[PDB]
Amino acid sequence: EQSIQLTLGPWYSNDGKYSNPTIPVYTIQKTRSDTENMVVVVCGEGYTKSQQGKFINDVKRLWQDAMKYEPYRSYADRFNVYALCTASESTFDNGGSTFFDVIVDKYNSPVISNNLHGSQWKNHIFERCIGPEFIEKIHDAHIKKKCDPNTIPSGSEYEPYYYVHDYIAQFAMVVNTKSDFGGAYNNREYGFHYFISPSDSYRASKTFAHAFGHGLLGLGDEYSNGYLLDDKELKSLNLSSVEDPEKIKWRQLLGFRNTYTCRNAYGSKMLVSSYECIMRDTNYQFCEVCRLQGFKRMSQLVKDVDLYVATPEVKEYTGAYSKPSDFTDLETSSYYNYTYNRNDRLLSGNSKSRFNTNMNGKKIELRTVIQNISDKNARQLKFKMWIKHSDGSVATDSSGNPLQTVQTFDIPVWNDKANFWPLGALDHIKSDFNSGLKSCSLIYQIPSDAQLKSGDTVAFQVLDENGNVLADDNTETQRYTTVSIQYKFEDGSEIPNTAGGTFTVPYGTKLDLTPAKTLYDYEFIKVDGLNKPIVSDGTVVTYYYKNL
Ligand SMILES: [Zn+2]
Ligand SMILES: [Zn+2]
């Protein structure tokens, strides 16, 4: 009941096998209008018509798994996700005719092969054919197509299609295979903004999250080689060749969690902020620099986000890794020595129980990084830190004074926001990493006469100007809860061409999103499940739309 139709001439289907395809559209997630959310369009490669149920379930699995990683998780309910059921004549492994002519080259890179059947512009199909039709028929903006992609253009072959990657934040192509491969194609000046990953490889979800890190978050491969020249140094979001810690772009993050600049290989001139990142090796999480940069990138596409508050940490303050000269050795072994030293001093998250009665007279530091997303309003955050007894009470010194401290930090405006992948940008040239960025450190001396008890821990809060708690000592290990979204007609029927997925949120989160006025041509009636704390797995939020 919901589909788009394409007209593919010889440049896109030279053998005529997909000259006029009908493509069913499935909505996996639609929590707001497409103008308010980041739109993700996923197509299938090497799935025959009878395998489209497998494709939709594969897209839901890979998507739900990608949304478990920060920074994507912080925006999980701000994406609209659509699965386009592109049918191939053959499965990918059987090797016959497929919708996207994907081949795996000698370097294990998956590519759309224009020369497989002579379709000269096959790898331009997303922005010249699928994108404009989807943006006209399905996307809430309903932008009319203005170009015929099968006729010879009189001017630029690229400029008429630049709008496609502003309405569609990302194109993803999932290949029906167990083969292990991954490929990201980002070059907006030449219309490319898609990636190719497999449905069933041993690391399928990890590959998907990594490739999405290039496409959506604008991040580079952290296994990259070479010395970055000035233009490449300024352009890169998460790589650097600056050996001086006083000048490196991410100097404010040094010593925050596992952030210690190091070479990405022996003798390498390419430096990374952490050796343990998914952008270098798919077995890891996103590093703090990738989390910050990716959060900043997505804030440009969903503009109701005001602040980034990295999860604070508490460590015993010994003086180690407290000044730039402590970060001059860039060997990978120096990164690992740094992480062992941090483990030995950690007093937060899973190491909260490492606080003991021998902490009297010792200093402790509450540290985090904050990014202001506003280019207009400066912010003031208040940090509170105290020593709390196992029975909730606040520990005191030998005179009855509580072992508590407070500090206020100013967060400057993000003045350079227009240079950081704003909506409509074709590239990234230069940006000031420190614009709107503030590393916050509260160093408190535990009194020599502190009355410490067995089971005491460090408690803390980060508060906004109105006293709202943005983060606390329970944040790092807080439970996440699974939410399921369902789409129904007024009579209770599941809306055809919907395949409602799940995402996770911090326990107690109140979802406050304005539902889209329409789902396909159905008008919104009501929603059950919003503006109420999510405190159970399998919590269902049901969106009701009126049938035609
Ligand atoms: Zn990569
Ligand atoms: Zn990283």
Residue numbers in the entry: 330 to 876, 901
Question: Can you provide the manuscript's text about this entry?
Answer:
The sole known peptidase capable of cleaving both IgA1 and IgA2 is IgAse, a unique enzyme encoded by Thomasclavelia ramosa (formerly Clostridium ramosum). IgAse is a ~ 140-kDa, seven-domain, membrane-bound metallopeptidase (MP).
The crystals were densely packed, containing 42% solvent compared to the average 51% for protein crystals, which accounts for the high resolution of the diffraction data and the resulting Fourier maps (1.75 Å). Two search models derived from the prediction in Section 3.1 were used, corresponding to domains CD + WD (N331–N807) and Oβ (R808–N876), respectively. These calculations, which identified P21 as the correct space group, yielded a unique solution for either moiety, corresponding to a single IgAse protomer in the asymmetric unit (a.u.). In addition, a formate anion, which is a metabolite of the E. coli expression host potentially taken up by IgAse during heterologous overexpression, was tentatively assigned attached to the catalytic zinc. The CD is asymmetrically divided into a larger upper subdomain (USD; E330–L546) and a smaller lower subdomain (LSD; G547–V634) by a horizontal, deep active-site cleft that traverses the entire domain and extends from the non-primed to the primed side in the standard orientation of MPs. Moreover, the third ligand in IgAse is also an aspartate (D550), resulting in a unique zinc motif (H539E540xxH543xxxG547xxD550).
